[PDB]
Amino acid sequence: SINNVNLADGNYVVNRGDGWILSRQNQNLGGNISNNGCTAIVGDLRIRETATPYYYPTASFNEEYIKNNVQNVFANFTEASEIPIGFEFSKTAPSNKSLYMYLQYTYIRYEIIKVLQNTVTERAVLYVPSLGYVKSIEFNSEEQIDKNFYFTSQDKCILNEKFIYKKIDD
Amino acid sequence: SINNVNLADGNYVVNRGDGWILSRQNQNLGGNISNNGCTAIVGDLRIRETATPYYYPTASFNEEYIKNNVQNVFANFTEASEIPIGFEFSKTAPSNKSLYMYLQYTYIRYEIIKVLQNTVTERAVLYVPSLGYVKSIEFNSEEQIDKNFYFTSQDKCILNEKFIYKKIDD
Amino acid sequence: SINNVNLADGNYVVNRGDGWILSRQNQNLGGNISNNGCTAIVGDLRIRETATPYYYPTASFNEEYIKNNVQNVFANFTEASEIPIGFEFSKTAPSNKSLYMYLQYTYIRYEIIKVLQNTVTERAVLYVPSLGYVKSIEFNSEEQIDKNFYFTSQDKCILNEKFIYKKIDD
Amino acid sequence: QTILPYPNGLYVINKGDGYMRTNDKDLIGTLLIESSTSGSIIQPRLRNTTRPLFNTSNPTIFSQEYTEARLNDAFNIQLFNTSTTLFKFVEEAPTNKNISMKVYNTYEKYELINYQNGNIDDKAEYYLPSLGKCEVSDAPSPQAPVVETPVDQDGFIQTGPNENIIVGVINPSENIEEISTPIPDDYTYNIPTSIQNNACYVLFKVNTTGVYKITTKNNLPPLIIYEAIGSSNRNMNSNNLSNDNIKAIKYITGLNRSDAKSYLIVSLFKDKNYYIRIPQISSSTTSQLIFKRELGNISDLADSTVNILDNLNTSGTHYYTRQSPDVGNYISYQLTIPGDFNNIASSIFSFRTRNNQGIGTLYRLTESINGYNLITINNYSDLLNNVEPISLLNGATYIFRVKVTELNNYNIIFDAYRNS
Amino acid sequence: QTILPYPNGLYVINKGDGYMRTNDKDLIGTLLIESSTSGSIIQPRLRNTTRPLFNTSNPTIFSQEYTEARLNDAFNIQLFNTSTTLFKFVEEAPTNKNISMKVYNTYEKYELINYQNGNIDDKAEYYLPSLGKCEVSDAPSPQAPVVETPVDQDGFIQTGPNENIIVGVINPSENIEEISTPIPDDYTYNIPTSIQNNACYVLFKVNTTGVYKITTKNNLPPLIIYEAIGSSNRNMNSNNLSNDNIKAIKYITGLNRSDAKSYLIVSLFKDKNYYIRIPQISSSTTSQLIFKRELGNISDLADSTVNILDNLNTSGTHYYTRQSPDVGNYISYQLTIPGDFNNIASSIFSFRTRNNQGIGTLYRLTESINGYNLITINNYSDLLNNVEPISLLNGATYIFRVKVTELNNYNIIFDAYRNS
Amino acid sequence: QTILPYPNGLYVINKGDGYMRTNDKDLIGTLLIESSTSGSIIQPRLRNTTRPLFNTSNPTIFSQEYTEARLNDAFNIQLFNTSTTLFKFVEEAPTNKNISMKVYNTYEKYELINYQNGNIDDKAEYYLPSLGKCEVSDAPSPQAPVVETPVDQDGFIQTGPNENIIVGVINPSENIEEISTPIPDDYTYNIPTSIQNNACYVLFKVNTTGVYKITTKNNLPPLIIYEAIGSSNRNMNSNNLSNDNIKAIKYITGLNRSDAKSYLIVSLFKDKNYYIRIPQISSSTTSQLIFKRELGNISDLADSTVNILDNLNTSGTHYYTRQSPDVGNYISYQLTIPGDFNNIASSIFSFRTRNNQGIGTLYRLTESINGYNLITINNYSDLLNNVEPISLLNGATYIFRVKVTELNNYNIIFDAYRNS
Ligand SMILES: CC(=O)N[C@H]1[C@H]([C@H](O)[C@H](O)CO)O[C@@](OC[C@H]2O[C@@H](O[C@H]3[C@H](O)[C@@H](O)[C@H](O)O[C@@H]3CO)[C@H](O)[C@@H](O)[C@H]2O)(C(=O)O)C[C@@H]1O
Ligand SMILES: CC(=O)N[C@H]1[C@H]([C@H](O)[C@H](O)CO)O[C@@](OC[C@H]2O[C@@H](O[C@H]3[C@H](O)[C@@H](O)[C@H](O)O[C@@H]3CO)[C@H](O)[C@@H](O)[C@H]2O)(C(=O)O)C[C@@H]1O
């Protein structure tokens, strides 16, 4: 399945791509409501103080091992974190209907995998705060909404997933 | 006239509505001039430090009595005041003519009235800083302007006035 | 040539106009790259701490003499400098091509000249930070660009030059 | 250099927005906006500091702090050298040409003046920092020939729309008395002895809307009356006058002239507050202020000063110089015909004016047990050149109302010519 | 006032966004936007402070700090009274009319409840500060007649789209045991003695995806099982269960009822983590948790609680009250026919239900050396009113699967009527 | 790996904008912008800190602080690790599809090099923080198959438009002398004894625009001359050279080669400043710098080094290796024909070149009391393969001008072949 990688034996650091949203954190930031052709805007600033990394270490790969190996091949998110970056989304509500849009942070999924016989034996995971994503739906006080709109039970990528690796040495 | 209310005897707190502009304060903030299709923008931030409430107490209703009774039924403007809110207006000057627009704060008019026989006997007034309002006029160095444009001699509401009450007890 | 002025003998302070860009400082601030209909925006804040005046004194006209005589007839740039002013430029990249735009500060050129027989004998120069200017060009990794686009070897004015004077007394 | 139809006192005049100094001394900057590009200049208030400009003809009395206090009294301006109000301009250049965007700082000009007898004795100009001016136009050619041009004269130019709003303020050096209870149909106020040292104002409100006759027991000295601008429909108590400390006052009617024996007739509304200015009474005998509600068409005189005419028992010219009302306003004259009353007996009169033009109305004042009543005797559409005589019953009293139509001089002269 | 098909425990329900108080207590302001003009209201977060609203029915246990911890367990909300998220509205008025822009602060409503036996014993409502609501409409006439209107009742109204998302969380007062190694096809866990003092959860993961039979050696007490929401595809080790401290749990199947003798049959995936809640065993004799991979169509029962029926050796009604599954989910009953086995011998049965409606399937349970196997004997499209009898072989075992189609009551009653 | 037609010294090369590291090490973020929605990424400078990138081949001399000083000398860059310049991108998605917005940080690449004899002996690359890159495109499918891809090699890629601007700077380790007074038509400068320890530059300006012959009394050593970029039309004094401390210098003409006996002929404008670099004179006998205004068509050689040829009194090849001018520029050679003058007597010559191609012009140098004069004897459109001989009058002097048209090697070889 997801553990079958065509790679020589050994440890690797993998960039699973930008655009990952986390489980059930969908509405942690709040939602915005507008109507009748009005324009709604929502944005943020992933200032270090706020948006923080999520680590999922394993016996072979601890927090430090993950960070250093990631910031070595890919973007050093620790240095970047000291420089405020902003992002916004805007959408215009429909003629005579209501609009609802909510925001959630996006991340970059990094993995530290242990390959042994073309199958992942161990897997560490890191989510680096990236930017944000908004979802919108038009509505009225009577409409029923698919709950999938509001809830994401399993981590996923809103963009195409990736698999860019580099064998770890030493 | 304005003192004839169809209410049982007793004291009341009344929300006279948002959108009130005060007498002769029309141009206290300044005016903006633009021309030839340019876009002019003016805005502000009613930060506590600046925009402050206007009280007009009576013998039966003092400043404190007015505040507490207002913040009890309606929006607590004291708590809100610590959170900066902004607003802006923008307008595009005409093809080959000049545009002038000026800004003034809007308020919410609250009243504490004493009803006795279906006529107001006493009336206290409170103006809570709300947002702002701009007025614009096109012009040229020769045109004469109606002074009503620049001056408001009597408090008024730029929106429809209101009368939402609640009898005061104790 | 440039030293032939039709003025009585004596010293003068001259406003050579706003819109001057300095030699080879073209790209000191950086460039911006965008594509496919995206909108690119670049701006700044000539906060005193940053943008600073450039003096070019002569034996007869020293730094102080230049400043006082300039701030006397024309805008007092020293007082103004304490109030942050901003400016921005925006441009939309073409359908399927890349856009590059870079920013550079503009100045106001002031001169202190010594006239003797209808020809300038001495000339002091002052450049007061004004605002900014952007230059843009569409491109692709193969195109060759005229280097004049990137480099300005001699001070010049992007607007029409000026010559507004006032005889200095005492 | 124009006539200002107001009583002596202080005035704050908003002379308009868009004022800026010459020689680009308020130029913030210029942007060259290339075609298919947008340019923008912003005043973000990252610093809330502003720099007002001030000029006075009397620094000891009309100091900047003093002028600011006046401006506060007139328009209630709170902040003078700070602002949190942002302003910004945005322009997009066409696809065919380049654009030049020039932005300047601006000011609203407020003029403070001490007006005395049709003359300005003191003056201060306060330039309140405003929200800028933006001039966009076709970008000039970088090759346009440089033309040596002489710097302009140091000063200000007006860029905004024409504006001239006069707001008068309570003279801060004259005390304010207050008639706490809403005056009923009849009321008499005893003028405090402080009036011996300086004029004072009396703040009051009528319990019932209507027309009132106000005056001193000897019809002397003359009284002036104002309305407290903005005082209507704020705090109110049916048994007490709620003060608002409103120092902005609108001149209703009245005169300063000492000999002007008279009384006022004005329309008053209960939802408002008023100020009656009593001149300084340099006497030692107590004076009074008499208020009286008036029913009947005496209201025709509504908002007017009624000057009682003296020395009518002679033939020929009978002049009366008085401060002229503004175009469209009234000024009345009361005439008690010299001699004894017996219908038959009469005297020929010719009403005229000299400096200012106006429309006149002649009334017969009649007494009743239901108040006063007026009977129109005639109307005049030209007072400056009126020659039409009229015979008036001896011993009877007439009131002549003048409505100014042409304000040529500060003073208007009334002439009750006696043909016989 | 609706049935909630879940086991006892804690739940955090997101009841929607757009909540705001009545009487404009959350009104930020109104802008009158004149035609051919644009208006804008902004929450720039120049201050990151927000003001949550809280309400609880039990302040000692369901305190605000406690509720916040639950909300964190359910949705992982980090910040409760601060925000760096900006929101802003922008509207342009047409050339023909003026527009009114009203902006309000809003909240997302999260309800915390202690659910016990189909009843809510404790409840807390937490209102998380949200990103506002903007109402634009034609500007009202400044002359519209003022209508005296009574203030509304103090409270909240829902402005956002309909939403009701139930997320259950590990009961923080019950300990969590962990089976470190991914359980193989067969595994037996010895329930620690702590189980004598309170229920506990057992966290584990299967080494191989498939169907499993889980139970205690006496099929008592009943077990409940959950999935750790979001636990899939994160950190992983083939020889060790990586914990994520995920306290958000999805109810798979199980019951609380004490006498409910049973075992579970559920589908399990190796890339996920699970929790089995073992009730408190008030005994002194060690208990066990037995896991067993099951091959064959026993999977037909996948995700269901199999209740072993007792006292079948009599005639007539045989009721069994149990917590009803939600519409669309299963609940099974196992029947070993009273008597001795010899094909020929049989007994007549009538399967029915009383409170809730559903679809039934009757299976014949057969033993093999390749696991269990089921043989469909019949299907029923109406259990509430089923009267069709069926003869079952004595000494044989049958399983009856119910799929709820109508959830009328918290409990569903199964009746294995015996005709003879 | 291309020829760089410049004298020895320091150079700062702006190699372009848009540089960023591989493997998304400069990726700021990606936004998925749903159809009918707008996305925006901003660098608001809420912190003015930037992070430059540096790389040097000699850390002891070409340190980052040193390189920064050079960059300052070349482009006058003020801030290296801070910025108040904001940049932001905004994109709106169509109604039919979703858009992907990727934004990266970027850098402008400035290369510092120590160029010696057509070779780079030291090198430093300074990456000045720039204003970003934004890539918008159709959003990829969340289902697109994941392709295992190997990470790229660590490094930089160029994203901006092609750019390569060479700016030379005064060698900071060589002193700068100054000729305070604008040199008249004739002037002689005595080279200070410091020249014995290291080369120096001499800063000066001509009083009158025109062509000048500059040289040492022995036409040795060779001189190089530069223009101070940006020095024109700033501060000025007719009787004094106003310094601007401009260290950015434009190479006009000159050579480094020791034996190159020569003098310069260049066009000079009074509104500019110039630098003449005098090599180190390892002697003890005072040297001089001789300036001389030249009237006449000697200007044909304008901006060129005139190499006086030696050892012409033999037959056959006569080579002369010298640093080649850049394509389009000149390099001259002066020939005094071996033998005594008497019109009739002549010698056959063949002018050619070996490495680089060019266009030649042969002049007859004539003396007059009105300066020098040149007479065109012939022109050559191919020097590399020229075989056309020409007879020159013995005892006479000729100048041969070469205009490079093809720069194949750092050095160009001139061959004054003697047929007889
Ligand atoms: C018929 C008749 O007698 N009319 C005379 C007229 C009246 O008697 C008064 O107006 C009273 O009704 O007086 C006239 O002037 C004489 C008086 O002039 C006043 O002038 C003052 C004036 O009061 C001030 O307003 C002004 O600022 O200053 C003037 C002085 O320069 C004197 O104060 C007063 O003592 C008299 O001299 C008149 O024109 O009204 C003459 C009429 O014939
Ligand atoms: C054929 C037969 O005997 N069926 C009876 C049935 C079963 O024996 C049991 O369900 C075991 O399979 O028991 C029935 O009820 C009797 C028992 O009721 C239980 O009620 C509890 C219940 O367990 C809780 O879930 C509930 O919250 O509280 C109830 C008490 O109000 C008692 O706990 C238990 O002691 C018995 O009294 C049944 O309906 O299931 C009756 C069947 O006839």
Ligand SMILES: CC(=O)N[C@H]1[C@H]([C@H](O)[C@H](O)CO)O[C@@](OC[C@H]2O[C@@H](O[C@H]3[C@H](O)[C@@H](O)[C@H](O)O[C@@H]3CO)[C@H](O)[C@@H](O)[C@H]2O)(C(=O)O)C[C@@H]1O
């Ligand atoms: C006709 C004739 O004699 N021409 C010879 C020519 C000239 O004499 C000189 O150029 C003077 O005008 O010299 C040639 O080379 C001999 C000299 O070579 C020089 O080479 C140096 C060179 O100067 C430097 O620029 C270079 O960096 O390094 C070279 C050394 O590798 C020597 O410095 C000098 O001592 C002589 O050996 C020539 O090619 O110009 C030969 C001509 O025949």
